[PDB]
Amino acid sequence: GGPSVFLFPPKPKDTLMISRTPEVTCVVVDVSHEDPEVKFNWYVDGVEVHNAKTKPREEQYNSTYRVVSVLTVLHQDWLNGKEYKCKVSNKALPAPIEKTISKAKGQPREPQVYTLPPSRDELTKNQVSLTCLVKGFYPSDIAVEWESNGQPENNYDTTPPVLKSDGSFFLYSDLTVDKSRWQQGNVFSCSVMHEALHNHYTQKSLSL
């Protein structure tokens, strides 16, 4: 009996691209159908902010409501480790609940990006696998794409980051392409977006 608060970070790709909207999301569950009103107060670094958008209530199968408020964050402030505080208040709730999240603490470290050509054994099939290995980056927030001839490349699949024993992360991306295109020596390119890279961006090409 009593509302509970969970505060979630922006998505990594949203934080690293100027055209997307990173946002912190304050979720409140277990709010009574009796008292269904919640008030949110948001503090960036202490300083209160007023442009947060609240969404409408939606009742769960639990017969309790879930109410959410999302706050847009400035790319830079997130990057520079500013604290985003969510205070919630409900009348079926004795004292306000506060939560604070932020960029992952710790020394950022630059990823190494390697491109691996298809295995000789895969040079059997109509389609081959182009591999991008991204290892040794901190924090785990990152974004990987593929391109060729200045155009995006659609069917790649990327693994989630995996924490290596030294405290950094690695992942792999697999872009599968028609072997006709690979055998022509067309140049494919693995794009990596990460806070620790110069201008937050690096490319690594692959062909022969």
Ligand X SMILES: *[C@@H]1O[C@H](CO[C@H]2O[C@@H](C)[C@@H](O)[C@@H](O)[C@@H]2O)[C@@H](O[C@@H]2O[C@H](CO)[C@@H](O[C@@H]3O[C@H](CO[C@H]4O[C@H](CO)[C@@H](O)[C@H](O)[C@@H]4O[C@H]4O[C@H](CO)[C@@H](O[C@@H]5O[C@H](CO)[C@H](O)[C@H](O)[C@H]5O)[C@H](O)[C@H]4NC(C)=O)[C@@H](O)[C@H](O[C@@H]4O[C@H](CO)[C@@H](O)[C@H](O)[C@@H]4O[C@@H]4O[C@H](CO)[C@@H](O)[C@H](O)[C@H]4NC(C)=O)[C@@H]3O)[C@H](O)[C@H]2NC(C)=O)[C@H](O)[C@H]1NC(C)=O
Ligand Y SMILES: *[C@@H]1O[C@H](CO)[C@@H](O[C@@H]2O[C@H](CO)[C@@H](O[C@@H]3O[C@H](CO[C@H]4O[C@H](CO)[C@@H](O)[C@H](O)[C@@H]4O[C@H]4O[C@H](CO)[C@@H](O[C@@H]5O[C@H](CO)[C@H](O)[C@H](O)[C@H]5O)[C@H](O)[C@H]4NC(C)=O)[C@@H](O)[C@H](O[C@@H]4O[C@H](CO)[C@@H](O)[C@H](O)[C@@H]4O)[C@@H]3O)[C@H](O)[C@H]2NC(C)=O)[C@H](O)[C@H]1NC(C)=O
**Residues in contact with ligand X by the rule CB under 6 A:** 4, 6, 8, 10-11, 14, 22-23, 25, 27, 29-30, 60-62, 64, 66
Rounded-to-5 percentages of helix, strand, coil across the chain: 10, 50, 40
Give 167's contacts (C-beta < 8 A, 6+ positions apart).
106, 138
Indicate whether 6 belongs to the interface with ligand Y (CB under 6 A).
Answer: yes
**Beta carbon nearer to ligand X, 40 or 188:** 40
Q: Tokens in use for 88?
A: 């919630």
d(CA 72, CA 181): 42
What binding mask, one character per residue, do residues 187-206 give for a copy of itself by CB under 8 A, x or -? -----------------x--
Question: Which partner, ligand Y, ligand X, a copy of itself, none, binds residue 116 by CB below 5 to 8 Å per kind?
Answer: a copy of itself
Indicate whether 195 belongs to the interface with ligand Y (CB under 6 A).
Answer: no
Contact 18, 50 (CB under 8 A): no
Give 184's contacts (C-beta < 8 A, 6+ positions apart).
none
Amino acid at 26: C
Among 87, 108, 170, 197, binds a copy of itself (CB under 8 A): 170
Instruction: Give the pairing of strands 162-163 and 169-178.
Output: antiparallel
Indicate whether 10 belongs to the interface with ligand Y (CB under 6 A).
Answer: yes
Among 60, 159, 183, 203, binds a copy of itself (CB under 8 A): 159
**Beta carbon nearer to a copy of itself, 41 or 131:** 131
What binding mask, one character per residue, do residues 100-129 give for a copy of itself by CB under 8 A, x or -? ------------x-xxxxxx-xx------x
79's enclosing H/E stretch is helix 75-79
